[PDB]
Every structure is written in structure tokens, then in C-alpha cells.
Amino acid sequence: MIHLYDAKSFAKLRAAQYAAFHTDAPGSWFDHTSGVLESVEDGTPVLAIGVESGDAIVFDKNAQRIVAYKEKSVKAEDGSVSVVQVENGFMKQGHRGWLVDLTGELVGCSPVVAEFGGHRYASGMVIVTGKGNSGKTPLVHALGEALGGKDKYATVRFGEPLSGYNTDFNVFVDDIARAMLQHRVIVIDSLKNVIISRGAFDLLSDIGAMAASRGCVVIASLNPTSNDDKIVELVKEASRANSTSLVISTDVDGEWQVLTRTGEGLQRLTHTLQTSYGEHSVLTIHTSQTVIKNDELESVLR
Amino acid sequence: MIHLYDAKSFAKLRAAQYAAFHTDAPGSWFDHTSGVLESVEDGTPVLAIGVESGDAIVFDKNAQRIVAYKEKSVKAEDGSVSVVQVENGFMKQGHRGWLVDLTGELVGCSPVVAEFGGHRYASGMVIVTGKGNSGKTPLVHALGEALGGKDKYATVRFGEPLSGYNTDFNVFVDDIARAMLQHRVIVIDSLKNVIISRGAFDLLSDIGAMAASRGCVVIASLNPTSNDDKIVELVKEASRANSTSLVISTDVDGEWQVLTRTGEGLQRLTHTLQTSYGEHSVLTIHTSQTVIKNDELESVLR
Amino acid sequence: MIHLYDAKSFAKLRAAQYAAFHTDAPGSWFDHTSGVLESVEDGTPVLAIGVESGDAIVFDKNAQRIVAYKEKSVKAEDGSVSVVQVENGFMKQGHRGWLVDLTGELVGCSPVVAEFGGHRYASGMVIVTGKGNSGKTPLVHALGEALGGKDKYATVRFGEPLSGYNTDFNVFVDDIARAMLQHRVIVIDSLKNVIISRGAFDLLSDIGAMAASRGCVVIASLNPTSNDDKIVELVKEASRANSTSLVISTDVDGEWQVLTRTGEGLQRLTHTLQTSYGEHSVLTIHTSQTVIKNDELESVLR
Amino acid sequence: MIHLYDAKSFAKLRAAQYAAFHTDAPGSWFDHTSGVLESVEDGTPVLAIGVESGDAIVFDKNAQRIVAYKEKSVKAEDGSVSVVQVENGFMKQGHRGWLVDLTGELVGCSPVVAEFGGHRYASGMVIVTGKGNSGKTPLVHALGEALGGKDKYATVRFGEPLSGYNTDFNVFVDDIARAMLQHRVIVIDSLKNVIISRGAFDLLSDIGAMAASRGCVVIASLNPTSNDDKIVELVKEASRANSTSLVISTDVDGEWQVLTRTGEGLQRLTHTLQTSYGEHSVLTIHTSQTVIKNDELESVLR
Amino acid sequence: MIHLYDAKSFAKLRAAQYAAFHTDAPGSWFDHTSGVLESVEDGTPVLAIGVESGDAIVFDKNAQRIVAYKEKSVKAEDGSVSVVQVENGFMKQGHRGWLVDLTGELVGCSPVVAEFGGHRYASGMVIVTGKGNSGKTPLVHALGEALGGKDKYATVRFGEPLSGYNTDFNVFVDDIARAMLQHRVIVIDSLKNVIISRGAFDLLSDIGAMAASRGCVVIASLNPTSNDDKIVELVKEASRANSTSLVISTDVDGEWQVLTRTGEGLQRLTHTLQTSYGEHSVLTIHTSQTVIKNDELESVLR
């Protein structure tokens, strides 16, 4: 919805946003939103996500598709009315994104998803990219396990020439929807085939917001290597603009730079990861805050 | 409508447009247009705005959508006939923009929206942009507050990978219509996902005129960095041609240049802002005429 | 129609075209075509112009839209059959442009619209363009007043982020049609949002011929400053070939070059204007035949 | 249709093609095809030409539109069947071009249309283009009169900002069809607005063939000056590939180079024209064979 | 169908493809396929070819179109089922190409079409191209005659601004289907207007395989000069990938290089032709193995 501020209420929002990353218990926002989701009336539509066509499919709290649902309208504080209607397996009225209110007045946060190696990590979309020798897929899995902590991470596999990989975009959207409804830490391997359709353009623009609203993290690899003067800027956009956090390989083998948006209008933070390989290419992130500026951010985006 | 002029009536127009920026009481135009919208017969359409598909949706004076409204024609001075008709939630006849008269014969104004720090600010669309180290989001909120003055400012949130951010363009047009129907000072964060569809193209081309006609100011951040021939120049277009005022970061950290169109055929003004951060990234604009010359404008652009 | 010539009838035509610019009383063609229009039967279609979709809307002599009109055919003298039919507001059979013959055998003229400051100006489309510091909007209004002479000039406003500006293309084609039907001197501010749709493309390629056939002048500002490799050339097309005259700013502030097509196959004339501002940015063109070659014209067009 | 040759019948075709340009009485092919046309059964469709949409309209021998015509099939020598059917003013079955056989086995000719100044000129499409100071429009008219000889030439006017100029492509197609059905020498001013739609692409590709088949000449001006890396190669294609003859301005004022395709596989010829202006810009071509090679042809196309 | 091989059966295939070019009697494949087409049950569809819209039209063995033909399925060796169905003049089920089996297990051949001047020539598509002074049209006809030998060659004429030239793409597909159904040696003048539509794209991709399957040769001229990134490289594609043999002009006037694919996986051969003109531009190829090495091929291209 729209929100109204004065100096005092604005200062209160920024303190709340700052807390949401810096001092909240890691993973507490996710537990909170899981509570909101479980308390919705049994058959309420909770999430809509674009399929390849630009149509939207709709899910309930248990990540089952809604196929038919008769018009229902809800009135917000700002006077806005939201109306949801599903017909023949597709949204007739509504919008893409969360169909129930997960946030209230607390918007523009990067809720802390996990702490690891003495650093807090933000929920939302994490793009793992870069150029050079360091392998993206082993890193996404290392980070999934590490931010998972005591919990298992969910793996969505898409668009690679390997066994059991789904290559149909509509199944991909179904996987991702289910992952965000049911798990705090999610890995996507890979965004290669997404980076095209209206659905594909909807996902890139939606997923960070959906994830941050939930308090889950989606850790996605993206090889920028299609080296054409159109796709290569869909990649740099994706990474600059469409991500909550960026994990970029460096000059040095096994070393990665993590750049984090900590919230709306807040400082972007940075830290480095050192990594090494064990048996069967299982990567370990070694374990035992620094602000980055828009000059140094565009510098790393190179 | 069309308007006819001779030397004398043209001189009067120019005097009145001058006044509308320079000597009218700040915010007086907004109050006048608020009174006119309050007096409209209750279920009259007052505003049409383009949705993503290029179709238009229509609102009444309380920012609720009009689903059905039977043909109604009105005759203007110049002889022209304006018609409005809404059917199954969409404009069947009419045009985008204000559907009742707020401006009268007085057209081509940049009505003063507020005065702050010894500077008058125009209503219409303010684009906050630039490259370099200064943060756009903190600035739009600092301006929102400052121009709000005694009044709270409204925040429309769109297309950023953060909690609670809407990413559906149609919800966004809803938010913006409600904002303009109900508040003098409005912030949009951000224009990145708009900068595409027919609706997106419509919005960029319509919003400044809508705002200026109302006497409200829409303050929007625009990241120019997408760096390709299509979008990088669609951004310079937007800032050059589709904006009433421009706020651009400079060489010096925390410093910004404000470039203001004062009305139809009138001179563009310029002034500088100095800023500083307090706690939790809250920005303050320090407070305790200069014309720019069309080639110095092209210099500022880039 | 098609016309047939031998050496003798061609010489006569060229003499008549020459006279239409050089010796006819200024504004006489306008009064002539006003008479032709006034003689047209009361609900007969006289003008069709393209809307955004590329469909055409149709007007009668009093600038009212025709909603329904039964198929009627008319036999021209070359043998051609012209059929007009209007259904549900849109032309179903016919063509864009004048639907009645304003011109006869007297075709390919640039009929003199006015004389000012010792110089004759042509009807048709006048594009006011160039770069540098001289302001286009003040100049189009100054020309408007100056060529209006004893008569008021009409102003069509479109696509600027200022109060009361229409931004809907279809309202815009409605305004221009009414203006050409009812007024000798017309200003458009501005062609910006036009330079896109089929309708936009149709307007650029129709309006100079429509105006010259009427004997009215359409004075339109075009800012070329949008430096896209595509669009920077659509401006030069518009100016080079879609215009009867060009008014371009020079190296010297306040000074403009006027380049005039005097008729079909005839010499293009050039002259300079000196200008100055008074109060509230009201510009005055100072007062008290030079042929220009191609290449010199292309030099100008850079 | 398809034609079968051996060495002997091929040598006979080439001698006939050579004669068709070099020794036939000038304008005799046109008289012959006028005879074929007048001897067709009264209501037979004789010509189909693409309108803007890519649909085709159909004409009879007297250049009147056929609106309804029931399927009729004709068997050629090669066994091919041609079938014509018109429905609701548009061709349902058939092809674009001549619908009656004007040529028989005598195909691939550039039939001589006229002789003037001691040089023979080919029927088909003549594009008058080039860059520099020499005026195209006065030359097209000079050439029309000169090749007209004892006959008047027909002028089709299209897409210029001057009085009485049609700007609707479908009326343009009607004009051109009528011109080729009824006159040996035809001038088009200009191809500017053609050089786009499917119809526009159909015309460029068809008109030379239609004209050569008839034995009429279509003399069309084309300013190449749209200087964009797409339109500018539609122009060079148009001129290189889609023309029977090319008339190109030179280094020297008033001087033109004429380059002629004399027939299928035959030599391209070249000669120069000297010209001067009289009163009211009426141009005279001064009056009282040379082969050109593909190296020198691409050289002139520069 | 698919074919299965082991070492031994693969060796046999390669021997038989070798033979099909090197030791079979010239023209024997054409006679074999002629017998097979003669024996087909009378109204069977034998050939489908793409029209402009991407739809396919279907012919019988006498080159007459099939308007209606009810579903009929046939089972292949590999288990695959081929179906053919024609409805209102268009293929409803089936594929483009030959609709009965002419090649058998022997696939991937360039069957020898003729021998001339001590050189064997392949069936399939021969593209005659190049820059420089040598004329393409005279050469395609000289080759047509020479390869025809005792037989006349067929000429398909398309898209040149000369008398009798068809310019309708659908008539062209008709001509070409008839040519391949009925003659061993075929000339197309020219490919310029094909080099676009779905049908045009289909033809370029299908014709060489159709011809080679039949054992006929299609000799087509292609002017490469259109000089833009889209078409100039679509031409090099056509000549590189879509052609069975290539004939390219050289440095030296009248001299040409012939580059021949001899079959699937076999070596490309090369030889040179010397030529001279007699009367009326009739070209003679003088008569009274060399492999090219893939990089020498890329050298010849350009």
C-alpha cells in the first residue's frame, strides 16, 4: 500500500529497518511470516507468480495450486481494495506477489536470514556471479548449507544439461513458489535459462521482493558469459538492480566478495569469503562490518 | 482544449504563469484543485491512468475504481466534446489524465508546491538521478519531508528487492492515482522497473502533467546505470523531456543540483543543496535565483 | 488525382505555383478553402486523420466527429472513385487527409499564409528546431502572433510535464484537426511525445500536406536533444522532408535561420530573424529573397 | 510461366531482347500492350497491386476497381493454371502484377519507351536520385515531358508537404495502377514516404516489372538523405536492384548520369545529361552508346 | 527417417555416396526418381513447398495443386509414421519436401547431374555469386545450357525489373515446384527478392535438399551487394550452408571458381571456368580433381 510519513515517523521506520538486519534474531522474520501464513483461513490464496505467458498461477499456504476461487475483496488502511479471483487455474483478478500481508507498516527491510562466520546475511535474492576460475555451483551449495544452519536448504534445479534438470519455465515457477512457501534457505541452479519471456521478466523483477517479504533467502547462480550486447546487460541489471545481495568472485582463487543491501536507504556492506574444496568437490567456506560506496559498487560490477 | 491568443492575451497568460510559480502562496494550487475535486458530483470519474496493457482504468475522487459508468458528453469552449464511458473496469471512451477541469484557461504552469531553505519548488515530476557517491533513496525522502512541511508525504514503493515492495505494475498505477488524488507531496521509490510496457510508456509520458495539473509534486528516483543504447537514453529522455524538475548529484559528496522549469516558455532555474546523514541513514538537507542556459543543461545531463 | 502535362500546361502550372507564394495576397488560399469547406453539405465528411492505433477518425466542416456515415462514392475527373464510409466512430472506407478537394488543378503550392517584417511565409508545416541556447517555445509563440497578424493564432498543447497539458495522442489529433478546420495560424507545443505509434507516424507524414492544402500554417517545436542513434535521425527526417519550412537556431543567441520551400520544384528561400525577450519571457521578432542550395541545407541540418 | 531453352532457342531470345531495346520503334511495345489490353473480354481483371496491408486490389482495362469476380482459371503452355477471384473489393485468388499475359515468350526485355537527344530510353522503373545541388523534382518533370514527346505524361504525387499531395498509401497505389493502365510516361513525386508497410515493400519489388511488361516508364525521385543505417540501404537496394534505369546527379551542377539496363543479361549503358533552368524553375535537358561495368556501377552507387 | 549404423554399414554408405557422385552415369539419379514419380498412384501428393505465409501447398506428380486429400498414414522402417492431409488448398498434416521416397537408404548424396568440360557437376542447389566485373545472369544461362546437354533447361524468372518477370512469391514457389517435378536442369533468376518471409526462409532452407533428392540441379544467381549486417550475412549463410555447390567470380574477368560438395562428409572439390561473350551477350564456357580445404573455403567467401 502507500504509506505516509513525517520526520518523526520516518526516523522510526529507519530505526526499525536498521534493526531488522542488524539486531533482530537471525531467521526470526521467517518464523514470524510462517506464523502469518499458518493463521490464514484454510483456502486463502497467498502467493501469485507469473508463468511463461505472463499469466499468473496462484498458491495456498501449503503450496498447492488454487484452480478456482471466487472474487473476494479486502480493504487496507490506505483505502486500497485488493481483490483476488482464480478461474481455470489462472488469476483473473489480483496481483503478482504475496496475496496476504506479511509486512504491515514494516516495509523496505532486508530481514536477517542467518548469521555465519561472524557475519549476518540478508534475506531476499542473492546472485552469485563473476568471471574467472572460482566455481559458482559449489559456492551456492556451500552457502545454502551454511545459512541453513540447523535446517536443510531447498534446491531448485533449472536449465542445465545434466540429469534430472527441469527445463520447462512453468515447472521452475512452481518449484520456486513451493520453496519460498516452505523453506528459509533456497538455492537455484541456475538462472541461465531465465536470463526472455514475460514470465521470465516477471520472476527477475519479483523474486527478491517476495523473498525479503517472507524472510527467506534465494541464492542463485548466474554465469554472465553470454557476452552479447543485450543479454549481458540483462545480467548486469539482474545483479545491480534485482538483487538484495551480490556474491562476486575476485582476482584470487577461492575468494569471494559479498555485497549486501541492509535495507531501504541503508548502507551497503561488504565482506570477503575464503573457500576450499574437499572430496567430490564439496566446498567449505572458512569461518574463524565494512561499508561500500556506489563508486566501488560499479567498480566491482566490471 | 485549444486556446486562441493575440499579443495582449498572450502577455496576460505569461504573467499568470510567472505568478503561478513566483508569487502565488506555496501549495495554493493544490488546495484549489482539492476543492474542485471535492465538489464533483459524487460518482463522477476524475482520473484515468494507463495500466500495463495500454488500457486505462478510471478513478473517482476517493481513489476507488469505477467499473461501470454510462456515456456522458460535455462540451468545451472551443467547441470540442469530451466523452467518458467505463465498462467492465475499463475506460471505453475518454482519455488518460484528469477527466474534470482543474487548470482552466491557466495552462502551462509549474505551480509552486512548497518553499524550503529560501527556494520555491515546482509541482509536477521531480526526477532524482545522477551517478557518483550520493544516495538517491535518502534524498527523495529528505525532499519528501522538506516539501511536505506541515503535511506528511506519501510513499509509493515499487520494484526493489526489499520487504513489502509491490512489483505488479497495475498495483503501482493504483498507488500513484491514490497518491495524486489525496496528497500534495509524493515520493516514488523507484522508477527502475518502469523504465517497457504500454502502461509504463504511458506513465512516463503522463505523470508530470497530471501532477502539475493537480499542484502536487511526485519525487521519483531513477538509477541511470543500466548502460545500454535503449535504456540509458530512455532515461536521459525521461529526465530531459518528461520531468518538471531535475535533481542531480554532483562531483562533491552530499551535494546536489536542482534544475527547475518554472513554466511554459519561462526560464529554467538552478540551485544547489548540501546534505548530511544522521543516525540510521536519515538525510538532512541544510537550509542555513540562478538561471541555467540550455547548453549548461546538456552539460549537466552527463 | 493524377494530372497530365505537356510542355505548355506544365509551364502554366509552374507559373501558378510561383504566384501562389510570390504574388497572391497573403492568406488568400486560406479564405478560398474556407469557402470550399463552407459549401460542403452539412454532415459531409471533410477530413480524416489517424488515431494512435492507425485507424482514422473523421470530421465534418464544423470540426465535429462523424460517428456514422453510409458509403458514398464520388467520381474524380481522372476517373478515380473516392468512397467514404464511417462506422462506430471510425473510417471504414476512405483515405487520410482532406476528403473534399480543396486544391483542384492547383497542386504543389506553398500558399503564402502571411507577410511579416518584409518577408512572406508559407502555409504548411513549419518545424522550429536546432540546438544551442535560443528557446524554441518562445519563438513558436512569437511566430504564431506575428503570422496571425490581425487574427488570433491557435495553440495545441501536447506532451509536456506542465499544467493542463493533454498527453493522450487521440485528444491531440482531435485538437489539430479542429485547429486546421478553423484557423489559419496554429502552434503545436510540442512534437516531442509524437517523435512511435502508427498514428504518430501518420501525423508526421500527413500534416504538412493537409495544412498547405488548407493554406494554414502549423508551427511546431521539435527538440532534437534526444541523442539516440535511431531517434536523432527520425527528427532529421521529420525536419528535412516532412516540413514546408524550417526555423533553426544559429551560433548566435537570439538569431534564427528561416528556410522556406516556395513550391513544387521551386527554389528554397532563406532569411534570418533577430529576436529579444521582454517581460515574462515574451519574445519579440525584430522587423525594420535569398535562395539557398542543397548541401548548404544539409550543412544547416547538422 | 517457366520457359525451356536450348542453345538455339536461347540465342533467339537474346537477339529478340536486344532488338526490344536497340532497334524496335520507340514506344511500339506500349502500343502493342494497349492492343492486348483492349482486346480482353470486357470485365476481365487485368492488374493486381498490393495495398498497405499486403492485400491486393484489382483493376479492369479501364482502370476501374473490380469488387466482385467469381473464380476463373486459365491454363498456360507450361501447364500452369492461373486462377483469379475477387471478393469484397480484394483479391481472394490470384497474384500481384499483370493478370493477363502481355509478353508471351518475349520476357526479360527493357522495351524502348522513347528516344530523345539521340539516346533511347527503356521502359520500366527509372529512379532519379543522388546527392549534391542538382534538383530531382525539376529533372523528373523534364524527363517526363521529353520522353512524352507528342504525348502528355502522367504525374502521380505522393507524400510531400505541399498542397494537394495525397499522403495515403492506398490512394497512391490506385493512382499508379491507373497511370500504368492508361499512359506510356509516368512521373512519381516522390518515393520518400514509400521507402515500411507490406504494400510499400510490394510496390518497390513489383513496379519495374509491371512497367517493363507494359512498355511504360515510371520516373520516380528518391532523396537518399534519411541517413540511417537501415533506410539508407533500402534506398541503395531500391536503386541498385529494383530499377530498370538509374539517373544520378554528378559532381557538376546540372549534370546527370543515366545508367540503363538494356535487357536480361545484356550490357548496361551509360550517358550524360546537361540541363538548365528557365523561368519558374522549368528545366530543359540539352539535346544537340557507352557500356558501364559492375565495378563502375558500384562506384556510382556511392 | 533415422538410420542406424555400425562400422561396416557406415563404410558401405560412404562407398555408395562416393559412387553417387564419382562413378554413377551422369543424370542416372534423375531418371531413377522420374520413374518413381511416374509410378505413384495417380492423385498422390508428391511434394510440399512453403508459401509466403509459412503454410505449405502440395503438388501431384504432374505439378498440379492438390486442394483436398484425406488423411493417409504410412509406416517407415524405423517405426515412424508419416501422414499427409490437404484441406482447402493447404497441407493440414505432413511436412515440407518430397512426400514419397526417392532416396531410400541412400541419403546424404550429391548425385551427379551432368558432366561437362571433363568435370562432373552435382545436383542440388548451385549458387552463382561474387563481386567484381563478371555477370551472373549470363553465367547461369551458360551453365543451364551446358549441364542440360541434350536436354533443354528450365528457367524460373523472379523479381527483376524487366518484362514478364513474376514478382509474386507464391507464383514463384509454383514455378519452382513444377521445374523440379519436370526437369533435371533449372535456372532461377534471381534470388534477390527471396533473400524475409516464412516462405522465403523455408525455400532457402529446403531447395538444395529437394533438388539433390530429385537429382536435379537448381542454378540460382545471388547479388550479395545489399551491404548490411542482416542481409549481407544472410547471403553468406545461404552460400555457405544452404548450397550444394558454389560458383564465384574471381579477380580475372570472365573467370569463375566452382566449389562442389561431393556428398555427406566427403571432400569439397574445386575447378575453374574460363568464359567469353558472343553476340547479344550470349556466354560460352570454354572446355578445350582438386580439393579445397575448409579455410581456403572461408578465404573464397569474401
Next chain:
Amino acid sequence: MIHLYDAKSFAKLRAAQYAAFHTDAPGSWFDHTSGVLESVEDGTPVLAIGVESGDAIVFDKNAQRIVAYKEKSVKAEDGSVSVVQVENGFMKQGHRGWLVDLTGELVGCSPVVAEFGGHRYASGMVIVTGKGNSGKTPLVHALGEALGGKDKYATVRFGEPLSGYNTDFNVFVDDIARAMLQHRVIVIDSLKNVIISRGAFDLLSDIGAMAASRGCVVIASLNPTSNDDKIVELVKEASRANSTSLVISTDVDGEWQVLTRTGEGLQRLTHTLQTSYGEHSVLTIHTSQTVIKNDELESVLR
């Protein structure tokens, strides 16, 4: 499906993936999935693949097209519902790829397809490419025979100007589907006319995953020699990211580099092949683990 991992189950997966390439008996995954397919109910859909339009056609285990199949849903173990329905020959509900689960929890493998000359080869898509003198078609057939071992390999032929080559995309997807259903070793000659439609785009992005899931190998030649700025990069995409292995020609004639993805997140291997020709261009690969880094892989990809 989605899968959930903690450190322990992830280590197990990576060990299983490692074994699937390095220690499983060559060709065992193929025989395993043959068993899964053989267990499928007699007319159950097992595979869907995109046709040219972007619609999907559907096959049963014996490679027969399914024309009609009533909606049937199946519940996966992650909770996902998979619904299949076929109507009028086309998939109405479902997804592209395998419609039955061939892989289980064992996903992200490059299952070993064969061992030859002391080296293990992976199933999936193998693209044979590069520039220079070494011939791609001979090599794909040599690999076909060599990896077939005791079994015959299947050859799908498409889009070459040679006898019996299918050029219809839809027959081509039919061939590939049948090949993957019935054979472990498959050759495609060639991918040329594929590298366009939605179907072509779908194939490039589906076939490596389909094959690897089956445990078959598709060996496809791709000539990059089409040097368009657009297409030269679609080839590198195809090769970089759409392939399980790459076979590229080197500086040295007859010599090829093999680059093999060994599984999800695992090291890429490299080895060299030496080759020679015998009679009728039959190539022999000579007989009697080196990891490769990124950057070295990009060096190769130039």
C-alpha cells in the same frame, strides 16, 4: 522436484554423482532408464518436446505420438502435482521433457555413456564445433561408432542441401524423440538450421538435460562459421552452456580437444583425440584424467 539437503545428505549426493561418471559401468544408466520406461503403462505419455510453434508433442514409451490423453495428475514427493493432458495431437497440460521420473534423487549427473580409448564419455549433449581444417561430420560419425561400441548408433539428419535430408523442424523433433527413446548413441547432422523459432529455442535448452536423464549421448555438429554479431554468440551460448561436453578442433589438423562436464559442481575434464581418414572419408579415432579450469575453457571458446 525440489530436493532438501543438509551437509551429510549433500556429501552423499556428490559421492553418488561422482560415481555416476567415474565408477559406474559405462552405459548402465541407459539400461536402468530403459527399464523404467519399459515399466510404464502401455499408452502413458513419457516425453514431450517442443514443435516449431512452441506447442509440444507427446510420445509413449514406444515412440508413438499420443493424439489424445485425458487429464491425469500425479503427486511427487516434494508435494508437487504433475498433470498431463493431450488433445488433438498437442500437449494441453504438462511440461516439456521427460513426463516420467527417470532419475529420482539421483539428479545432476553426467552418467557415463561409454568408455573408448582409455577415456570415459558422458551422456547428454556433445557439441562438435570449432574452426580450421578438421571436418566436423566425419568426426561425429567416428564418435558415433566408437561410443556405440557393440551397438549401432542412430543418425538424425536435418537441414543440409543433400539427398534425403529432412528440412522440416517438426519431422526433426520427431526423429530426436524416437532416437532418445530407443538408442544410447545418437548423431545429429546438423544443428545448422536450428541455430529461430520457439521450437528451435526449446530444443537447444532441453536436449542435453533430456539425454543425460536418459543416459544417452547426442553428438551434434555445429559450424560456427556464420559470423553474424548476433548468431556467432548464440553458437557460443549453445556450446558454453547448453552442452554436457564440447569437442573442438585445434590448430593441428586431425586433432581435437574433448572437454567434459563430469557432473553437478564437479571438475571439468579435458583430453585430446588424434584422427585420420581412410577410404571414402571414413575417419578413425586413434587409441593405444586432465582437469580443465575456467578461463582456459573461455580461451578454448574463441
